[PDB]
């Protein structure tokens, strides 16, 4: 994916490796090597008036 | 509906694929305060206005 | 020294997970009507009213096919009398 | 399938929509013509309807599921003669209320990040076919300015903004649920925060949520503005100035405009306040202990968020070729043959967003013909009298 | 012997997570 | 009229139910004139109706009683004539 | 009646389901036509006998 | 198949497009006779035609 990753608090259970939201769309993952969990915002986009 | 103001009467003009009306209304315009009163008793019988 | 055995179907569910993350609740999308309903609004408690969930449809049971006539001859070539070199 | 709500209880009954009785779990079953309903007791005795099944037939009532006739309403024959009136002797005043929508959300697709994501191989396929995203942006972008539109014709019909005087004597009428509270933030009625605490209302591939134009605090502005000018002045400010009168004047001038004479009201002029007073105070009762009486404003954003939920879970579908993500195909397959994979999934996009845009387009003049009957409603209803009826 | 298995043997799926939501 | 596919749902009224509200609104407007409308039905007798529905558009009350079998008979045969308009021209 | 696309047409999404919920929304708008025109009246009033 | 599905498809979705321009049309009218059965039947309106 693209994005850019955070410091999240949402606490996984212990199998599993990211996170979904109700669009089925990726906003969290566990990294391996650490376990941390990272969020996962979209690169800013929008329009130029 | 027909313009601001109470209106008085209005005027079509036609417009290409349109149309124009030009609505002629009554503004109220330079107003004085007052004093009222609901009604006024004379005789111990109240009178509305009309 | 006693134990269950079941068997897994392919059916649909609806799981409920939680703030936490876990599955709390879950609904069989074939069990009854009502759970029907419950996986088509996507949620598990229902609103009075009418909801359509799926379709109806007969299925076909048999199957069923100008009086066969004209078979082709042979019996004249094959059990002839005489052949030819 | 007929449900009385899982908060009353679990029985269902079942409406097979067109089918005789004979074809097919069985309890009682009830032909209809509009079907066939199982699970459902049919009775003679002939009620309201409060879910409808079809060609006449309604549906829980003393612990089962009931089907019948439903009833239009309570009979009477009103007592004709030729020389017999009737008269009324007293009066009720009633405050009812509308709810009507007048704006939806602003979202803006862009198509290229929609439909390709980064992949300039979807981009650059996607070049060929034409003028396509322009035009849905186009389409978009007339509907985003038509919301701010629908907004400023209902509310901004006042040039000025006028204020309620600081002491309220009203004649004894109580406009304290309809005026703006002070001691408490962004300046509303009580009636204006229970309505926005009883609707509940995501930024990601595409997608972006354009800001209304008016904020929710000059809403309430204009608004109020309207409020102050009804209450001080009548309806002498939707015409010219605002000429300021009593309000037992100008509601003995509103008796006045329906038939009865001004001095029913000022005799009566303590009753009526009270039944003011006692009748828009039932208006917070009936909005906060009764749900879903803003459902005409709930479905409104409920379909606007489904349209977009199924826009963006319709990226998740093969449409054909053989993977729904943008990156294993490129990393899968040759290209001149990914690039038939590739365009198979852009004509799949591509028709579920002209298919979400189509349904904006015609959900969006739905929206802007119930915010010209709202413009309708505060010219004629707020800023006048109206003596057309309903 | 034969016993009603009444609403158990639920598993997690797919070792998503997934918070406060009704996944079909 | 269903084949593959495609079903055609009945109405929830049924047209006996729809000409029952029609008739509730028509047998209203004649016994108690608008006044079903806004609040109870108040009754009152039809040429005294009318009269106010003269006296609504500014013609005085008077021009109905004293040309009340006039009124009735244009109005009767006015309604007779609406059935001709539409058992003939298509 | 074939299982050929009730297969591929599954690779299609939600479009099924979303032209079944248009056409829902249609016919159940019908009624409220039809409740709004006619159903104006609290009550059945009936004309008298002679 | 799939051409016979995207040929059916794309025709159903332009006859439910049709339909919602009429059902629009429809609601329309059935608005503007539901003002009528309001002001024309039970009050007498002053709207000129």
Known sequence: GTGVLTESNKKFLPFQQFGRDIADTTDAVRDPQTLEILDITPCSFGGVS | ?50 | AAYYVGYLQPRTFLLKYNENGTITDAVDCALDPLSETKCTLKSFTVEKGIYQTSNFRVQPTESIVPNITNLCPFGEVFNATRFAS | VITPGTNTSNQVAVLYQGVNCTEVTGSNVFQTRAGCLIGAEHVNNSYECDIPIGAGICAVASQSIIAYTMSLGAENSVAYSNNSIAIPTNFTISVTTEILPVSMTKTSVDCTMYICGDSTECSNLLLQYGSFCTQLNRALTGIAVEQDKNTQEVFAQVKQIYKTPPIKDFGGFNFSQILPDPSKPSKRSPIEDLLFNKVTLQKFNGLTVLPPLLTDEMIAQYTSALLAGTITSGWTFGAGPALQIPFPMQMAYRFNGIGVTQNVLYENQKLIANQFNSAIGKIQDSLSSTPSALGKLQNVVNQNAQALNTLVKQLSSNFGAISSVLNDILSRLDPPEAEVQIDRLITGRLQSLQTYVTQQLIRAAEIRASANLAATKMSECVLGQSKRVD | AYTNSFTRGVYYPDKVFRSSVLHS
């Open chain 2, 1 to 50: 509906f027909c313009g601001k103001g109470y209106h008085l009467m209005s005027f079509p003009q036609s417009a290409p694929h349109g149309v124009v009306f030009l609505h002629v209304t009554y503004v109220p315009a330079q107003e004085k305060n007052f004093t009222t009163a609901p009604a006024i008793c004379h005789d111990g019988k109240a009178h509305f206005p009309r």
